[PDB]
Design an enzyme around this catalytic site. Structure first.
Site, mmCIF file in Angstrom:
data_model
loop_
_atom_site.group_PDB
_atom_site.id
_atom_site.type_symbol
_atom_site.label_atom_id
_atom_site.label_comp_id
_atom_site.label_asym_id
_atom_site.label_seq_id
_atom_site.Cartn_x
_atom_site.Cartn_y
_atom_site.Cartn_z
ATOM 1 N N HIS A 1 83.957 30.715 61.468
ATOM 2 C CA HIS A 1 84.302 29.455 60.764
ATOM 3 C C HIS A 1 84.681 28.302 61.650
ATOM 4 O O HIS A 1 85.762 27.707 61.524
ATOM 5 C CB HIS A 1 85.331 29.695 59.643
ATOM 6 C CG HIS A 1 84.789 30.525 58.534
ATOM 7 N ND1 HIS A 1 85.163 31.827 58.316
ATOM 8 C CD2 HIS A 1 83.889 30.229 57.566
ATOM 9 C CE1 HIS A 1 84.511 32.306 57.278
ATOM 10 N NE2 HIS A 1 83.728 31.358 56.812
ATOM 11 N N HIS B 1 79.164 26.755 62.782
ATOM 12 C CA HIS B 1 78.865 27.063 61.390
ATOM 13 C C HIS B 1 78.671 25.803 60.524
ATOM 14 O O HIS B 1 77.806 25.742 59.664
ATOM 15 C CB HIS B 1 79.924 28.018 60.821
ATOM 16 C CG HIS B 1 79.876 28.211 59.345
ATOM 17 N ND1 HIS B 1 78.864 28.877 58.706
ATOM 18 C CD2 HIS B 1 80.741 27.861 58.381
ATOM 19 C CE1 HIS B 1 79.093 28.920 57.402
ATOM 20 N NE2 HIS B 1 80.225 28.303 57.175
ATOM 21 N N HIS C 1 83.060 21.299 54.730
ATOM 22 C CA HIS C 1 83.327 22.351 53.788
ATOM 23 C C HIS C 1 84.218 23.485 54.322
ATOM 24 O O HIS C 1 84.793 24.252 53.514
ATOM 25 C CB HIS C 1 82.064 22.931 53.178
ATOM 26 C CG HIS C 1 81.487 24.035 53.955
ATOM 27 N ND1 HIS C 1 80.709 23.817 55.051
ATOM 28 C CD2 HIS C 1 81.590 25.368 53.818
ATOM 29 C CE1 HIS C 1 80.407 24.975 55.605
ATOM 30 N NE2 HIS C 1 80.945 25.928 54.880
ATOM 31 N N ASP C 2 84.366 23.562 55.643
ATOM 32 C CA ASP C 2 85.245 24.572 56.260
ATOM 33 C C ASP C 2 86.186 23.975 57.260
ATOM 34 O O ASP C 2 86.729 24.687 58.093
ATOM 35 C CB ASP C 2 84.435 25.660 56.968
ATOM 36 C CG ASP C 2 83.896 26.778 56.017
ATOM 37 O OD1 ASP C 2 84.545 27.120 55.032
ATOM 38 O OD2 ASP C 2 82.887 27.419 56.367
ATOM 39 N N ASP D 1 75.507 28.052 52.795
ATOM 40 C CA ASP D 1 76.670 28.773 53.356
ATOM 41 C C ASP D 1 76.357 30.246 53.500
ATOM 42 O O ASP D 1 76.889 30.878 54.389
ATOM 43 C CB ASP D 1 77.828 28.596 52.380
ATOM 44 C CG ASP D 1 79.249 28.686 53.035
ATOM 45 O OD1 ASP D 1 79.387 28.600 54.269
ATOM 46 O OD2 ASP D 1 80.207 28.691 52.204
ATOM 47 N N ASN E 1 72.630 32.740 56.531
ATOM 48 C CA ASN E 1 72.421 33.373 57.815
ATOM 49 C C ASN E 1 71.394 34.532 57.739
ATOM 50 O O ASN E 1 70.632 34.726 58.652
ATOM 51 C CB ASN E 1 73.725 33.991 58.413
ATOM 52 C CG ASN E 1 74.875 33.007 58.646
ATOM 53 O OD1 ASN E 1 76.002 33.456 58.723
ATOM 54 N ND2 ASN E 1 74.612 31.721 58.838
ATOM 55 N N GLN F 1 75.917 44.784 56.366
ATOM 56 C CA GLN F 1 74.915 43.745 56.131
ATOM 57 C C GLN F 1 73.891 44.122 55.045
ATOM 58 O O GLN F 1 73.496 43.284 54.250
ATOM 59 C CB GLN F 1 74.205 43.345 57.425
ATOM 60 C CG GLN F 1 75.044 42.504 58.351
ATOM 61 C CD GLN F 1 75.586 41.259 57.668
ATOM 62 O OE1 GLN F 1 74.841 40.483 57.087
ATOM 63 N NE2 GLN F 1 76.885 41.065 57.730
ATOM 64 N N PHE G 1 75.668 43.599 51.794
ATOM 65 C CA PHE G 1 75.783 42.148 51.582
ATOM 66 C C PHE G 1 74.454 41.598 51.074
ATOM 67 O O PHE G 1 74.428 40.864 50.087
ATOM 68 C CB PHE G 1 76.205 41.489 52.900
ATOM 69 C CG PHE G 1 76.375 39.996 52.859
ATOM 70 C CD1 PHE G 1 77.044 39.373 51.876
ATOM 71 C CD2 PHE G 1 75.916 39.208 53.959
ATOM 72 C CE1 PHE G 1 77.227 37.988 51.895
ATOM 73 C CE2 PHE G 1 76.110 37.846 54.003
ATOM 74 C CZ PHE G 1 76.738 37.209 52.950
HETATM 75 C C1 KRD Z 1 76.413 37.498 58.978
HETATM 76 C C2 KRD Z 1 76.570 36.599 57.805
HETATM 77 C C3 KRD Z 1 77.726 36.977 56.874
HETATM 78 N N1 KRD Z 1 78.332 35.995 56.215
HETATM 79 C C4 KRD Z 1 79.279 36.171 55.314
HETATM 80 N N2 KRD Z 1 79.841 35.073 54.801
HETATM 81 C C5 KRD Z 1 81.087 35.054 54.312
HETATM 82 C C6 KRD Z 1 81.595 36.052 53.484
HETATM 83 C C7 KRD Z 1 82.929 35.999 53.111
HETATM 84 C C8 KRD Z 1 83.731 34.963 53.522
HETATM 85 C C9 KRD Z 1 85.167 34.884 53.064
HETATM 86 C C10 KRD Z 1 86.080 35.277 54.188
HETATM 87 N N3 KRD Z 1 86.495 36.573 54.165
HETATM 88 O O1 KRD Z 1 86.398 34.443 55.053
HETATM 89 C C11 KRD Z 1 83.217 33.988 54.307
HETATM 90 C C12 KRD Z 1 81.892 34.039 54.717
HETATM 91 N N4 KRD Z 1 79.721 37.401 55.029
HETATM 92 C C13 KRD Z 1 79.127 38.426 55.676
HETATM 93 C C14 KRD Z 1 79.508 39.803 55.325
HETATM 94 C C15 KRD Z 1 79.793 40.689 56.297
HETATM 95 C C16 KRD Z 1 80.105 41.981 55.957
HETATM 96 C C17 KRD Z 1 80.068 42.410 54.647
HETATM 97 C C18 KRD Z 1 79.727 41.522 53.683
HETATM 98 CL CL1 KRD Z 1 79.634 42.057 52.005
HETATM 99 C C19 KRD Z 1 79.449 40.203 54.016
HETATM 100 N N5 KRD Z 1 78.080 38.233 56.598
HETATM 101 MG MG MG Z 2 84.607 28.352 53.254
HETATM 102 ZN ZN ZN Z 3 81.162 28.043 55.261
#
Ligand code: KRD
Ligand code: MG
Ligand code: ZN
Ligand code: MG
Length: 334
Positions: free
Chosen positions: A73, A77, A113-114, A228, A231, A279, A282
């Site tokens: 973040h 990003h 946004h972040d 957002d 990726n 991943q 996700f």
């Molecule tokens: C490699 C890209 C990526 N982006 C995001 N984005 C994201 C998910 C949750 C948050 C909230 C937080 N925990 O800060 C923020 C960004 N999440 C993941 C992720 C990683 C591991 C497991 C999961 Cl379900 C999602 N991967």
């Molecule tokens: Mg955010």
């Molecule tokens: Zn973001």
């Protein structure tokens, strides 16, 4: 170096810009140089009479309030979400649909946004009774903060990039930006997706036809949310760097939790991590469902994005040597 930076910036309209290289070449100013390029390309300086020096000064200050030490973040990003939104705005199915003000709103929302993200989640901030969670009454804590900072910075010396908008244009831009950034709160994902589905079910074409604010703002909210969560749809060399960064950030939150004697949150334990299976989960439960619906809305414009996503899933599946499901339920549902 200036010549090499400009050659990279030639790809600004393409999905898969080398944003990390751009960050290196700009002396860690990817948000500033990408936003400036984009503002020039869209003629937004002329349209909204934004002095160039004012734009640069705001941009540099905004970028300084992203935390360089936070692994995911950060300003890189932010630059990426900006640039991804910029490409999504130009998809054929949306030609001539948005006004210039709506375009400015979406890009500005993406840039801020972040901003000032501390590298820990909303749930961490709530559960530790943090100052931010006290300020915002536990709801969209970070997202309310990103908005507040993004707008407050306009007040610094020579930073007011909206000085020559009309009162009605400023009000309308502020309302849109708030709606967009609040929709980046991950806990709103399922509701946003449901509403996007419903819109695709009743869509009218001529190119999409959007009759009212409610439909337009919905599409912008979903757009930025897709950006957002973009990726895993990017070329794999990029995706893999974003994955390593997000896990580093999460594991760091786990370490803070461990030092305070808290239960370690799902996905945040460096001693019990399953990066590749996580991943795949996700993609299967969050990213593919969202992007498949976006692809329907703009059919056939986003077909290649979908195919890349599917190839990228196979790669993570193929490199596998409570947690996914607990993380998803806690993160993406209300
Ligand atoms: C490699 C890209 C990526 N982006 C995001 N984005 C994201 C998910 C949750 C948050 C909230 C937080 N925990 O800060 C923020 C960004 N999440 C993941 C992720 C990683 C591991 C497991 C999961 Cl379900 C999602 N991967
Ligand atoms: Mg955010
Ligand atoms: Zn973001
Ligand atoms: Mg304080």
């Amino acid at each position: 170096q200036e010549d090499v930076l400009a050659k990279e910036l030639e790809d600004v309209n393409k999905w898969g810009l080398h944003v990390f290289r751009i960050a290196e070449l700009s002396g860690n100013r990817p948000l500033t140089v990408i936003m400036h390029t984009i503002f020039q390309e869209r003629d937004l300086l002329k349209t909204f009479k934004i002095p160039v020096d004012t734009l640069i000064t705001y941009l540099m200050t905004l970028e300084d309030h992203y935390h360089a030490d936070v692994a995911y973040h950060n300003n890189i990003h932010a630059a990426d979400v900006v640039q991804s939104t910029h490409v999504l705005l130009s998809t054929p199915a949306l030609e001539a649909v948005f006004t210039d003000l709506e375009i400015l709103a979406a890009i500005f929302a993406s840039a801020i946004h972040d901003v000032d993200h501390p590298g820990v989640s909303n749930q961490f901030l709530i559960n530790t009774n943090s100052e931010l969670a006290l300020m915002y009454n536990d709801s969209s804590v970070l997202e309310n903060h990103h908005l507040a900072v993004g707008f407050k910075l306009l007040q610094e010396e020579n930073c007011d990039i909206f000085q020559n908008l009309t009162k009605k244009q400023r009000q309308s831009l502020r309302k849109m930006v708030i709606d967009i950034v609040l929709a980046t709160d991950m806990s709103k994902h399922m509701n946003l997706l449901a509403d996007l589905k419903t819109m695709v079910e009743t869509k009218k074409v001529t190119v999409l036809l959007l009759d009212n604010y409610s439909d337009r703002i919905q599409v912008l909210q979903n757009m930025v949310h897709c950006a957002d969560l973009s990726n895993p749809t990017k070329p794999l060399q990029l995706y893999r760097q974003w994955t390593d960064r997000i896990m580093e950030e999460f594991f760091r939150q786990g370490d803070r939790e461990r030092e305070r004697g808290m239960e370690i949150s799902p996905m945040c334990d460096k001693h019990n991590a399953s990066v590749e299976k996580s991943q795949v989960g996700f993609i299967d439960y969050i990213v593919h469902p969202l992007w498949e619906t976006w692809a329907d809305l703009v059919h056939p414009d986003a077909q290649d994005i979908l195919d890349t996503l599917e190839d990228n899933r196979e790669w993570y599946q193929s490199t596998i040597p409570n947690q996914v499901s607990e993380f998803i339920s806690n993160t993406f549902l209300d």
